[PDB]
Protein backbone atom coordinates (compact mmCIF):
# COMPACT_ATOMS: atom_id res chain seq x y z
CA UNK A 1 0.00 0.00 0.00
CA UNK A 2 1.12 3.56 -1.03
CA UNK A 3 1.04 5.83 2.44
CA UNK A 4 -0.68 9.31 2.02
CA UNK A 5 -0.94 12.92 3.59
CA UNK A 6 -3.52 15.95 2.64
CA UNK A 7 -2.88 19.89 2.31
CA UNK A 8 -5.78 22.19 2.93
CA UNK A 9 -6.10 25.31 0.94
CA UNK A 10 -6.91 29.25 2.00
CA UNK A 11 -10.44 28.23 0.05
CA UNK A 12 -10.63 25.28 2.25
CA UNK A 13 -10.80 22.52 -0.19
CA UNK A 14 -7.67 19.90 0.15
CA UNK A 15 -5.31 17.98 -2.15
CA UNK A 16 -3.83 14.36 -1.42
CA UNK A 17 0.05 13.73 -1.68
CA UNK A 18 2.05 10.29 -2.04
CA UNK A 19 4.96 9.77 0.69
CA UNK A 20 7.97 7.97 1.99
CA UNK A 21 9.85 8.08 5.26
CA UNK A 22 12.72 9.51 2.94
CA UNK A 23 11.22 12.64 2.29
CA UNK A 24 11.89 16.47 3.71
CA UNK A 25 9.50 18.91 4.53
CA UNK A 26 11.04 21.02 1.00
CA UNK A 27 9.72 18.07 -1.15
CA UNK A 28 6.48 18.37 0.32
CA UNK A 29 6.87 21.97 -1.29
CA UNK A 30 8.01 20.20 -4.37
CA UNK A 31 5.11 18.12 -5.02
CA UNK A 32 3.01 21.08 -4.42
CA UNK A 33 4.90 23.04 -7.07
CA UNK A 34 4.32 20.70 -9.58
CA UNK A 35 0.89 20.43 -9.03
CA UNK A 36 -0.28 24.40 -7.96
CA UNK A 37 2.67 26.05 -10.10
CA UNK A 38 3.22 28.12 -6.68
CA UNK A 39 6.89 28.46 -6.25
CA UNK A 40 8.99 26.90 -3.04
CA UNK A 41 10.37 29.91 -2.28
CA UNK A 42 7.09 32.06 -1.82
CA UNK A 43 4.79 28.99 -0.14
CA UNK A 44 4.69 27.47 3.20
CA UNK A 45 3.30 24.56 5.25
CA UNK A 46 1.83 24.49 9.14
CA UNK A 47 0.49 21.93 11.73
CA UNK A 48 -0.77 22.31 15.23
CA UNK A 49 -0.21 26.04 14.97
CA UNK A 50 3.21 25.94 14.17
CA UNK A 51 5.29 25.88 11.08
CA UNK A 52 7.21 23.37 9.40
CA UNK A 53 10.59 23.64 8.38
CA UNK A 54 12.45 22.88 5.02
CA UNK A 55 15.54 20.92 6.41
CA UNK A 56 13.54 18.72 8.09
CA UNK A 57 12.26 14.63 7.37
CA UNK A 58 8.39 13.41 8.29
CA UNK A 59 10.52 11.39 10.56
CA UNK A 60 11.73 13.66 12.25
CA UNK A 61 8.57 15.34 13.11
CA UNK A 62 6.62 12.13 13.78
CA UNK A 63 4.76 12.70 10.57
CA UNK A 64 4.02 9.23 9.49
CA UNK A 65 4.96 7.36 12.39
CA UNK A 66 2.06 8.58 14.70
CA UNK A 67 -1.01 7.51 16.19
CA UNK A 68 -3.45 9.60 13.15
CA UNK A 69 -3.22 10.53 9.72
CA UNK A 70 -2.23 14.36 8.61
CA UNK A 71 -3.68 17.30 7.18
CA UNK A 72 -1.30 20.10 6.76
CA UNK A 73 -2.18 23.62 6.60
CA UNK A 74 -1.46 26.27 3.65
CA UNK A 75 -0.37 29.57 5.12
CA UNK A 76 -2.66 32.67 4.82
CA UNK A 77 -2.30 34.70 1.46
CA UNK A 78 -0.22 32.56 -0.24
CA UNK A 79 -0.43 32.86 -4.06
CA UNK A 80 1.62 32.82 -7.34
CA UNK A 81 2.21 36.18 -7.26
Do not use: W
Amino acid sequence: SHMQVSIEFQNGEKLKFNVQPSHKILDIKEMIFKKTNINVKDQSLKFAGNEMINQKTLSDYSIIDSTEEFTLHLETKLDLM
